Design a protein around this ligand. Structure first.
Ligand SMILES: O=c1ccn([C@@H]2O[C@H](COP(=O)(O)OP(=O)(O)O)[C@@H](O)[C@H]2O)c(=O)[nH]1
Ligand SMILES: [Mn+2]
Length: 287
């Protein structure tokens, strides 16, 4: 029923990439008509899910801020379910939620290496999608916990498969992208190939699509382990390989996941989400 032109106007942002060669829109501030989309989705009575992992000190350092900002800005006006995965439920910061927000917490096993904690999310998310998320929501977003919502992050971001443009490389050329370049890895992307550099901090789509994204990425992660190699940027390297092979039906501009360390250039009109300063010395316990 919904057609791209119904809610997307690329001409509102002529100075940036608004359309991919495969006709997927790149959502920038100014190009979307949220009112039209809210009405459309509200009539379908959709529910949107959001998964977030917090293992170790990531809990105390970022979970409350993430949840509090999500409650305030994520898909306002629509039912939302926050799926919280932590290794220690007793440290779960139970904040007060607002209208249309609800949640559930799951205790997970903490992997030894932070690299595996980050990558195991792919296996875990898949298991939960099959077990219950597929029956609970129409769209699902999987996000890093080390970031905070700054403004409305709404229905204009929904789609079959959604990818996020990484803030530092959205204007670079593919051969400058930090893809995994070793042919021995399942995440390998040869120079001369690639569309964009996607950030693994945010990705989503329908439960069916996210299930395939996560399943394929974990298959690549497991394969590399058998070949004694680990992608340079772990799950992000694999996610980029996946989105190269299976193009996302929608892409979000850096405005949806911005790093203020860069400053605030002209292209970034309204920040919906921002990066948390890195604190590896404290939140990570290995290499
Ligand atoms: O010890 C760890 C490592 C990773 N994570 C989760 O995995 C995501 C990916 O990690 P990180 O944010 O450290 O990656 P970076 O964005 O800095 O590459 C984090 O946001 C967390 O949600 C976690 O909870 N504990
Ligand atoms: Mn992160």
């Amino acid at each position: 029923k919904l057609k791209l032109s119904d809610w997307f106007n690329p001409f509102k942002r002529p100075e940036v990439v608004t359309m991919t060669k495969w006709k997927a829109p790149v959502v920038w501030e100014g190009t979307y008509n949220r009112a039209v989309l809210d009405n459309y989705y509200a009539k379908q009575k959709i529910t949107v899910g959001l998964t977030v992992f917090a293992v170790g000190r990531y809990i105390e350092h970022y979970l409350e801020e993430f949840l509090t900002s999500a409650n305030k800005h994520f898909m306002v006006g629509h039912p939302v379910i926050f799926y919280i995965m932590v290794d220690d439920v007793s440290r779960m910061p139970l904040i007060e939620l607002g209208p249309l927000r609800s949640f559930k917490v799951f205790k997970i096993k903490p992997e030894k290496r932070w690299q595996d904690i980050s990558m195991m999310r792919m296996k875990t998310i898949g298991e939960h999608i099959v077990a219950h998320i597929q029956h609970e929501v129409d769209f699902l977003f999987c996000m890093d916990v080390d970031q905070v919502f700054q403004d409305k992050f709404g229905v204009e971001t929904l789609g079959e498969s959604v990818a996020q443009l990484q803030a530092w490389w959205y204007k670079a050329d593919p051969n400058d992208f930090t893809y995994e370049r070793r042919k021995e890895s399942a995440a390998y992307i040869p120079f001369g190939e690639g569309d964009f550099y996607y950030h693994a901090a945010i990705f989503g789509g329908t439960p069916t699509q996210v299930l395939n994204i996560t399943q394929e990425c974990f298959k690549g992660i497991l394969k590399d382990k058998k070949n004694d190699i680990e992608a340079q940027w772990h799950d992000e390297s694999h996610l980029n390989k996946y989105f190269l092979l299976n193009k996302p039906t929608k892409i979000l501009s850096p405005e949806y996941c911005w790093d203020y360390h860069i400053g605030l250039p002209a292209d970034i009109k309204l920040v919906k989400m921002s990066w948390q300063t890195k604190e590896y010395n404290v939140v990570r316990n290995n290499v």
